Amino acid sequence: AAPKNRRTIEVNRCRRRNPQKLIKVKNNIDVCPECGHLKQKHVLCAYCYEKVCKETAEIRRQIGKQEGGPFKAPTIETVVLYTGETPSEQDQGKRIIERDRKRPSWFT
Amino acid sequence: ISHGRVFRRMGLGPESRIHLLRNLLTGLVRHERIEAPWARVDEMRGYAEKLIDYGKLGDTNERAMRMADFWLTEKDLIPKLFQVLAPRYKDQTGGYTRMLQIPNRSLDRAKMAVIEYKGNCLPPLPLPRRDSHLTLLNQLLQGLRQDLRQSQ
Amino acid sequence: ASQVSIRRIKDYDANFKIKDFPEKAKDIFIEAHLCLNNSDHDRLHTLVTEHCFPDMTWDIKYKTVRWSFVESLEPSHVVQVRCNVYGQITVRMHTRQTLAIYDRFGRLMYGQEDVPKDVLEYVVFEKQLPYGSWRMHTKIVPPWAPPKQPILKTVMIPGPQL
Amino acid sequence: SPTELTEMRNDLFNKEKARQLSLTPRTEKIEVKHVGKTDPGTVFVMNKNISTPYSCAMHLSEWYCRKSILALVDGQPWDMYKPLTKSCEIKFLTFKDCDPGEVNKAYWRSCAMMMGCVIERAFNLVRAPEVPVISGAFCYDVVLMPTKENLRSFTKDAHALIYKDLPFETLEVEAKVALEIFQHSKYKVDFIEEKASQNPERIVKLHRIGDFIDVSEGPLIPRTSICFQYEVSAVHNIRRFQGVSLPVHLRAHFTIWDKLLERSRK
Amino acid sequence: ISRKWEKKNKIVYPPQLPGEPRRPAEIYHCRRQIKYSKDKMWYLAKLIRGMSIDQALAQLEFNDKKGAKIIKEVLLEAQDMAVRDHNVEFRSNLYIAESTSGRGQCLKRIRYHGRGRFGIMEKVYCHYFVKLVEGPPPPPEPPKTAVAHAKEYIQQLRSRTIVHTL
Ligand SMILES: [Mg+2]
Ligand SMILES: [Zn+2]
Numbered sequence A: 001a002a003p004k005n006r007r008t009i010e011v012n013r014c015r016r017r018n019p020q021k022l023i024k025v026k027n028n029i030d031v032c033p034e035c036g037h038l039k040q041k042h043v044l045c046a047y048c049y050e051k052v053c054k055e056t057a058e059i060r061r062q063i064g065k066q067e068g069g070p071f072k073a074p075t076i077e078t079v080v081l082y083t084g085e086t087p088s089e090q091d092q093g094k095r096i097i098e099r100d101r102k103r104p105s106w107f108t
Numbered sequence B: 001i002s003h004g005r006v007f008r009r010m011g012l013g014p015e016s017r018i019h020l021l022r023n024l025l026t027g028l029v030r031h032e033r034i035e036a037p038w039a040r041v042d043e044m045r046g047y048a049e050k051l052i053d054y055g056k057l058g059d060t061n062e063r064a065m066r067m068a069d070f071w072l073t074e075k076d077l078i079p080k081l082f083q084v085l086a087p088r089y090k091d092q093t094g095g096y097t098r099m100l101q102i103p104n105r106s107l108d109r110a111k112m113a114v115i116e117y118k119g120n121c122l123p124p125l126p127l128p129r130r131d132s133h134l135t136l137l138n139q140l141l142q143g144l145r146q147d148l149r150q151s152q
Numbered sequence C: 001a002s003q004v005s006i007r008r009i010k011d012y013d014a015n016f017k018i019k020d021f022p023e024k025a026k027d028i029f030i031e032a033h034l035c036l037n038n039s040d041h042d043r044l045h046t047l048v049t050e051h052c053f054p055d056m057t058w059d060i061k062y063k064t065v066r067w068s069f070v071e072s073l074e075p076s077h078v079v080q081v082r083c084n085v086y087g088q089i090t091v092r093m094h095t096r097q098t099l100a101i102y103d104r105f106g107r108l109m110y111g112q113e114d115v116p117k118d119v120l121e122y123v124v125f126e127k128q129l130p131y132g133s134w135r136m137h138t139k140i141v142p143p144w145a146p147p148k149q150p151i152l153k154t155v156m157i158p159g160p161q162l
Numbered sequence D: 001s002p003t004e005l006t007e008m009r010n011d012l013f014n015k016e017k018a019r020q021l022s023l024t025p026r027t028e029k030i031e032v033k034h035v036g037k038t039d040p041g042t043v044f045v046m047n048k049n050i051s052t053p054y055s056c057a058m059h060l061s062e063w064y065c066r067k068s069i070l071a072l073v074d075g076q077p078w079d080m081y082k083p084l085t086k087s088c089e090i091k092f093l094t095f096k097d098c099d100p101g102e103v104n105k106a107y108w109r110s111c112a113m114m115m116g117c118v119i120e121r122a123f124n125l126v127r128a129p130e131v132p133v134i135s136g137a138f139c140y141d142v143v144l145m146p147t148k149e150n151l152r153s154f155t156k157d158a159h160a161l162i163y164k165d166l167p168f169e170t171l172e173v174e175a176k177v178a179l180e181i182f183q184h185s186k187y188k189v190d191f192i193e194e195k196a197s198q199n200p201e202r203i204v205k206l207h208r209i210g211d212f213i214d215v216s217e218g219p220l221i222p223r224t225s226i227c228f229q230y231e232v233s234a235v236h237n238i239r240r241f242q243g244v245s246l247p248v249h250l251r252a253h254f255t256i257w258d259k260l261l262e263r264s265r266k
Numbered sequence E: 001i002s003r004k005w006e007k008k009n010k011i012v013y014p015p016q017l018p019g020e021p022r023r024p025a026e027i028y029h030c031r032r033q034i035k036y037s038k039d040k041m042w043y044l045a046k047l048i049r050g051m052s053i054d055q056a057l058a059q060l061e062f063n064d065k066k067g068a069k070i071i072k073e074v075l076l077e078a079q080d081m082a083v084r085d086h087n088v089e090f091r092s093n094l095y096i097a098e099s100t101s102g103r104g105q106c107l108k109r110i111r112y113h114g115r116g117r118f119g120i121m122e123k124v125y126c127h128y129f130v131k132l133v134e135g136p137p138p139p140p141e142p143p144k145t146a147v148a149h150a151k152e153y154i155q156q157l158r159s160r161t162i163v164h165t166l
Helices: A009-016 A044-068 B013-029 B039-057 B062-071 B077-083 B136-151 C004-011 C019-037 C041-045 C053-057 D001-023 D053-060 D064-067 D099-124 D148-164 D175-181 D186-198 D253-265 E038-049 E051-058 E067-083 E148-160
Strands: A080-081 A095-098 B033-035 B112-115 C069-072 C079-084 C088-097 C119-124 C134-139 C154-155 D043-045 D071-072 D077-081 D140-142 D169-173 D204-208 D213-215 D229-231 D239-241 D244-246 E026-034 E094-098 E128-133
Touching: A009 B112, A044 A095, B013 B033, B013 B039, B013 B062, B013 B077, B033 B039, B033 C041, B039 B077, B039 B112, B062 D071, B062 D169, B136 D253, C004 C079, C019 C041, C019 C088, C019 C119, C019 C134, C019 E038, C041 C053, C053 C069, C154 D053, D001 D169, D001 D204, D001 D213, D043 D053, D053 D064, D071 D099, D077 D099, D099 D140, D099 D148, D099 D213, D148 D229, D175 D204, D175 D229, D186 D204, D186 D213, D229 D253, D244 D253, D253 E067, E026 E067, E038 E051, E038 E067, E038 E094, E038 E128, E051 E067, E051 E094, E067 E128
Parallel strands: A080 A095
Antiparallel strands: B033 B112, C069 C088, C079 C088, C088 C119, C119 C134, C154 D043, D071 D077, D140 D239, D169 D204, D204 D213, D229 D244, E026 E128, E094 E128
């Protein structure tokens, strides 16, 4: 196929300036109760997700430093404890993951 | 046409799809949290449901042992799956895992989501907390329920 | 210490008089302020040194101002004097002044225009010691004078963003 | 006549506003901190007799202005349009909080005042009864039989007043001026006297809704646009008028709306 | 080369009188050299045109697009400059009035097509202009109901007169 004539700026606009191709205004943005960085409905907050990701990164780093090399993963649960906080008498067999700093305002 | 067709497509075929599913399941059993696209996320969740069911069926069973060995190439994760994730959920029935959507990525802008077994030790994700019971509509509904109870 | 500096200035000037110095200082101040009102950098540089030029012209850039002068309270007295080779002279002032700085699109953000205010000033002067004159240098904000006027608009100081 | 009483009340309110504004020493800068759970924590250098928490919300973000309703000043809730006296703290509150009791009471009082204004403009009031939120039916006694058409007309008038979008002009008037304003009504005079005797000093809080003035106890709703839904259940007996309304972000779809209407009809 | 958007911010207006309006504060800002296409830039601008700064930032924080972050950073820089330089106290009392885009200095490369023939690979480049105006955003033009159409038709039928004679 080959164009027999040249398209016009008017036809180009009518093709690209239609509501179908134009970005639709979404109304799923809401304010998060914590922090405050306008999250989205049915989606987790960005700041909280990044904080949880960093916490998991540090926990995995400490676990690797404790376990040592690969091919480990014992058959016992884990308990993340920060500075201080005497270990509870319930989790006796669960190996402790001594963490630094204090507990945040969302870990329970 | 694909009416009532389950199991979506992933890699270069069913073999690659099941291989990716097994790899994701192993990575989850190792770390207990993985970021994957929504499709693969729900697929891995559905597979981990049956995996936990098999692990709960029994350890001495040869079928469950073979299934665990085929679905966990790390080997070291089978003892954990059998002696940590099985007794911990001995009170529940089939409700496990947790589905939460991730906003977007940074390159391809994919619709990723989170997966993790209930409980565990990792930090808790910001679950979608519903409206408090002390709001206006909640208080109105509570008053309506109280009136209905007083009626009968 | 002040007498030695005065003698050195009178020797290197050499013609100089302090009895008629406050009047010339006030005249130079008024001329510099009128030039600022008119925005004449050429005439301003000839009255203010290079150290104080950006301190009063950069912040007031892109915004007019209507400075006024009327009736000087008390005579301008000199505090101290000290002394390449630049002679420093600190002059004390206390006159009624106005401040009506207008932004780009008009509006208002400082004091009124027809309301004089009493503001203390400790202007420091300097001079080149072959072709120089007594030009301002710096402003000593002592003594413990009132802070400033209340800005019409409101400002929001943000805290530590994590 | 009702055409001159409202005019005189508006004139007195304007005179009181002018008197309250003609005492500040030409802009008195102050500082207010924002100690809240979100964005910890900026400090605003607003005024004390002109600025309002609405200015702080605007400085922060439009979301705050769209969601903020009250502001706890040292534990006491304040309206969005009110001068922040002295240097204190601010805590923006919304409808989805842990303990939105103050916001609920403010919304109740605002709905009561709006219903009273609608009743006065339709065709003598007495006061605004402080009905808890568990009752689910704000009342407003009136001292004068309506039918379904009357209720429909009242709801239409309320919807029109809401669409008009009028802010709530609050003030901190004394008792003498408060009594001089509502001198043609003995019930309001007695209510103002009781309110003044309850507190240590006089300080009789008054509010205005464009052209109607009433008397309340706690804060109120800033703009009437927040009251999305609004209806009038029935009228009970001094005639008591019921009703139920729901603001934005709390839509009852339709079934829950009808259920709440039936519950309040009792 | 022609840089005028950055120079429009240096237009000093005369002072106003007490009996005159407040007059808004027209702020200008733009970024040069942006590895992006002009069509998508104009699309994003139109999406942000009929909106406020807060709503624009909210929509950009979730709009999956390479230029979304660039536009967000440009808007943030403009707001900062307005709060620090142009004397703008209210951050939410701002709305985007005009926002357009234009191509940039496009280079030229080779794509190497099949056979003994090649093609041209024009390095696409563009910019992005923004014009922030103080005050709340204006309401959109409401849809003319039947009353407006009837009034317009009545006016049209009334304007007519005898033609082709005296
Ligand atoms: Mg594929
Ligand atoms: Zn959050």
